[PDB]
């Protein structure tokens, strides 16, 4: 059949905010991962319920490859059970997560000298997102019991804060690309399978 | 000031193997992407590879897989054309271009004077 | 993918004129990866459209453009003299920057 789409989510050029995470629909493919072993020394490939090896030589339903730069320093919130601030109100997986985690350094394309404002992270929400859940809102978020209008206040903020991310920085301030692959694998009809 | 100069024109036969320079300066050629772009005599321009001065990450285009290597010596701040057999066809004006703060990693914001290579007889 | 674009184009001074760029490619995170670079006979090209809702610092704000499905398009807001130069437009969507064969605009005046 027709290759997979692997294209465009790992050879694109900006990804997105993390509170604007994409999906794209794979389906109808031959998913051959071995164009992923040899792109780039990636940081972390920890797959759940699955292994790397072990990947071609399997169908599954529908695939979607979700893509969205983070800080170094809060790579170990997307992964199960994980709590925190991208965790918790901008992308969180669910414990009963069956894919496979991307993740690999981004300073040399997505980090400027001068600042990479592009990249935006929601810090304050009422309430944490469900798995699989966006917030792609920017109402101001009401601290304080005052009420709040569409201008910022002393007791109500912006909710979306913007990772400054300079070359200059040390590792763990660096960006680093997620491509969070979720697989669901069961006896459910197979649209895109590995190279036979 | 911020400034992307060349090397002068070489004027090449086949086989001689020339190799073209760019010193960057104004800036940190650390930092910032640093390409070639070609451009034939009545076409339009060409895009053959971009490098990263910090680490050796070279991105070339499927037309320039192995025709061209891009290098950056960063102890100078200047990057390298290195042709090897060249051909009569690579009888063009080639432009560098940097990134720039404005756009993406790969948008090309500054660009050269360009060198005018001619490979003849 | 490959961008076409008309080898030539014509104007009149103080009118406006439309660059047609078919075979923009997309990612995932943006689609308007799109830009047009000027070019003067015997010197550099000059970036004057990235971001296409966005315009450079320099350029004059008669130099604005739009954006139409996989097509791109760039209006001068009045035509002058010193417009007289080729255009390419690029998509530098799929980390590889792509560059069409040039618009060659003749101003009459």
């Known amino acids: 059949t027709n290759l997979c789409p692997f294209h465009e989510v790992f050879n694109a050029t900006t990804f997105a905010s993390v509170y604007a995470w994409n999906r794209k629909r794979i389906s109808n493919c031959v998913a051959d991962y071995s164009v992923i072993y040899n792109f780039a020394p990636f940081f972390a490939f920890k797959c759940y319920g699955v292994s790397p090896t072990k990947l071609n030589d399997l169908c599954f339903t529908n695939v979607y490859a979700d893509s969205f730069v983070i800080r170094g320093n809060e790579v170990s919130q997307i992964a199960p059970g994980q709590t925190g601030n991208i965790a918790d109100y901008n992308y969180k997986l669910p414990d009963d997560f069956t894919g496979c985690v991307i993740a690999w350094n981004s300073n040399k394309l997505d980090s400027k000298p001068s600042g990479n404002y592009n990249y935006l992270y929601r810090l304050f929400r009422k309430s944490k997102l469900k798995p699989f859940e966006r917030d792609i809102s920017t109402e101001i978020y009401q601290a304080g019991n005052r009420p709040c209008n569409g201008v910022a206040g002393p007791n109500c903020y912006s909710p979306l804060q913007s990772y400054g991310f300079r070359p200059t920085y040390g590792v763990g301030h660096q960006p680093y690309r997620v491509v969070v692959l979720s697989f669901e694998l069961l006896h459910a009809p197979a649209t895109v399978c590995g190279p036979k | 000031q911020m400034q992307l100069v060349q090397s002068g024109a070489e004027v090449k036969k086949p086989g001689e193997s020339l190799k073209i320079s760019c010193k960057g300066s104004?800036?940190?050629?650390?930092?910032?992407?640093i390409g070639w772009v070609r451009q034939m005599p009545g076409k339009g321009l060409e895009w053959m590879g971009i490098?990263?001065?910090?680490?050796?990450?070279?991105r070339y285009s499927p037309s320039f897989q192995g025709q061209v290597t891009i290098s950056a010596d960063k102890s100078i701040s200047t990057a390298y054309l290195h042709w090897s057999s060249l051909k009569a066809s690579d009888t063009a004006m080639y432009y560098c271009?940097?990134?720039?703060?404005?756009?993406?990693?790969?948008?090309?914001?500054?660009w050269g004077q360009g060198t005018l290579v001619t490979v003849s007889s | 993918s490959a961008l076409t674009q008309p080898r030539s184009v014509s104007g009149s001074l103080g009118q406006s004129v439309t660059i047609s760029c078919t075979g923009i490619?997309?990612?995932?995170?943006?689609?308007?990866?799109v830009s047009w670079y000027q070019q003067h006979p015997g010197k550099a090209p000059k970036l004057m459209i990235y971001?296409?809702?966005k315009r450079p610092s320099g350029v004059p704000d008669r130099f604005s453009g739009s954006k139409s499905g996989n097509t791109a398009s760039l209006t001068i807001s009045g035509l002058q003299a010193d417009d007289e130069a080729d255009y390419y437009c690029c998509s530098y969507a799929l980390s590889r920057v792509v560059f069409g064969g040039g618009t060659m605009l003749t101003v009459l005046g």
């Open positions: 104004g800036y940190t050629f650390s930092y910032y992407w």
């Open positions: 971001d296409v809702s």
């Open positions: 271009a940097r990134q720039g703060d404005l756009g993406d990693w790969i948008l090309l914001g500054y």
């Open positions: 490098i990263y001065p910090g680490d050796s990450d070279t």
């Open positions: 490619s997309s990612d995932v995170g943006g689609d308007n990866y």
